[model samples]
Target: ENSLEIEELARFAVDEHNKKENALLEFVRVVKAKEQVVAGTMYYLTLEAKDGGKKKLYEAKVWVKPWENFKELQEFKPV
Candidate 1:
């Protein structure tokens, strides 16, 4: 089951990737998701997106600190 929070993370991953890479990537859907407890939390996501008019699968890692309202994209690459 995909929770609302997971969906938000997926969107965040897409948006962050776009901004960092200066590329246009439209969020499609989440394929897989995992969360690990850390200093805050680490999100592992396998997501789909429309990149340059083509649908592609990508893996992304995001670290978030909810209390501080901070989030960072650790990795993003097509798979």
Candidate 2:
């Protein structure tokens, strides 16, 4: 179950995909979990408005990779 913030982030990812036509824009880091360390291969996408002298409308994770065992698997999808 995703919280409101998570759901919004997922939706933003989809919108970014539609705009960029690139999966690289959909990669994001999971940093909120306290007990579970985020796996290096897991990722999500995040979007932001241009602010603070930044030009990017979106930013994503750079290091995470798709799981080797399930190459096509994604951790979540929008409802």
Candidate 3:
């Protein structure tokens, strides 16, 4: 169901945010989340953060394998 997707995504963001101090840093926000059911399954997430300097971007993704095994990512950029 759609709940799984919602839960997973939200959980990921939160869980990840608490996973690192940097993730919980100030001047950070979610840029976007792009989900595509066109081909198979995919989701893109963009997060921006700054440490009193130029903004850094991070775009992570979860390859939708439906459940579990979706740990594969399309992109994970830290800048």
Candidate 4:
């Protein structure tokens, strides 16, 4: 819905998972969000030289859609 929304979503994924230990500011954004058969999805971001940065798979929740690692993110995962 905004300019930075997509990229910010990526950053949010990392923070949501305690992947980056919840930093306030970061040079981060998601590369892919791999959704599995379950509602949860694996949130991946490139933290460069950061061990491939798997973060954690964020489960789907409803914001009338999803949030904090959510649904419909299936396509983006490993996309």
Q: How close is every model to the real structure, measured as TM-score?
A: 0.93, 0.29, 0.45, 0.29
| Model 2, span 1-32: residue lDDT tens | 23554444444444455465544333333333
Q: Rank the candidates by TM-score, best first.
A: 1, 3, 4, 2
Model 2 clashing residue pairs (backbone): 28-44
Compare the candidates by TM-score and give the number of the best one.
Answer: 1
Taking the tens digit of each residue's C-alpha lDDT, what string does model 4 give over 39-78?
4334333331122444433332212134554433222121
Model 2 ranges with Cα > 4 A deviation:
22-79
Root-mean-square deviation (CA) per prediction? 1.3, 10.2, 5.5, 8.6
In TM-score terms, candidate 3 sits at: 0.45
Model 1 regions more than 4 Å off:
none
Candidate 1 residue lDDT tens string, 13-76:
9999999999889999999999998999999999999988789999999999979989999999
| Cα-lDDT of candidate 2 | 0.38
lDDT of 3 by residue, 5-58 (tens): 644563465445546445553335666677778445777776665535657776
lDDT of 1 at 70: 96
lDDT of the candidates, in the order given:
0.92, 0.38, 0.58, 0.35
Query: In model 3, where do residues sit more than 4 Å from their true spots?
Result: 1-29, 49-55, 67-69
